[model samples]
Target: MAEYGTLLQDLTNNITLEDLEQLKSACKEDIPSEKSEEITTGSAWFSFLESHNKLDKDNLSYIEHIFEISRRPDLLTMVVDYRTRVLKIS
Candidate 1:
């Protein structure tokens, strides 16, 4: 899963705080208000998602969807890039 690790870390670091906040809402019932509020940085977002099992290499489509919903359409590029890399392997 280290393949996902690097790509996801890059995506998280590139995300703005506003987009990070929207991601929580985009997750809807998956994340509570308190939990979302605790995500003060991209690093935290990575941890939260990792802990929740809400993302993975195979979950690129869903990941891209969330970025779309969060109004961070530009971020979709990373998701696509990750998918492309994954396709080369399996």
Candidate 2:
């Protein structure tokens, strides 16, 4: 779990096509394509929220739940950083 957390941090901070490819390679067996799609959907939702400046408590809670259920706190952290720190949505 610690290792995954570290990896997630890397993904969140240093995301690139190569980094993403590496992540896919690392988790190819562990993560299913459907689950990856769910992550993609969650990412899209965050993007939508960012675009509309709608990263409110309700939306944050909703997306947090989405990533929590999907077991991707990494994605959650990424979304939070982008919306809060990067875009300054809040």
Candidate 3:
């Protein structure tokens, strides 16, 4: 679980949608295909949120904030958009 959390946060923070898509096309991807589904549906999200600096066991606000953020499509979309733009440039 610790390893998954560490790897997942790094993956989330580093890769873009295009990279993920390419990896998927090449059958070299480990993450599931659906972003929104992945965001809310399983232990992966829990692990990710747990590992993220914004959310950790000692912070109650972290838990509430993440749940709130999870439901916020606009914020998530902005994050994705920013990631996509930055990744495309590189």
Candidate 4:
């Protein structure tokens, strides 16, 4: 679950999925098979991928729940902005 928080924090602070993937690939010299890991109790991306890979049924529903919680677009934007600052240090 912590991973999700870290990822969310990372995303909100400064990096996007594309940026993180690029950074990791460039730094490690290896394509990361797993781009997202569980850092927090609830993570939309993890559930998104889980459903994408068919690792679990109802993963889409879980993702929907995240959107429901983040229903405010403005709030979501705020989170992204905050994450940008937080992750910049990382």
Model 1 bad stretches (over 4 Å):
1-3, 56-63, 66-74, 84-90
As a whole number from 0 to 100, the lDDT of residue 6 in candidate 3 is: 42
> Cα lDDT of all candidates, in order?
0.64, 0.45, 0.39, 0.39
Q: Give the Å error, residue 44, model 4.
A: 20
Candidate 1 residues 24-50, lDDT tens each?
A: 555434555667777665455556666
What's the lDDT of the predicted structure labeled candidate 1?
0.64
Task: Write candidate 3's Cα lDDT for 1-84 as tens digits.
Answer: 454344334444544454333323322122334532455323345443444433333332332234344464443454445344
RMSD in angstroms between candidate 2 and the native structure over all alpha carbons: 11.4
Per-residue CA lDDT of model 2 for 30-86, tens digit only, reads 344554343332243333344445435554454345456556767767756644553
TM-score per candidate, in order? Answer: 0.54, 0.34, 0.24, 0.24
Model 3 residue 32 distance off true place after TM-score fit, in angstroms = 8.2
The list of candidate 3 runs beyond 4 A from truth reads 23-90
Over the full model, what C-alpha lDDT does candidate 2 score relative to the true structure?
Answer: 0.45
Best candidate (score: TM-score): 1
Best by lDDT: 1
Predicted structure 4, TM vs. truth:
0.24
> Which residue runs of candidate 4 sit more than 4 Å off their true CA positions?
1-70
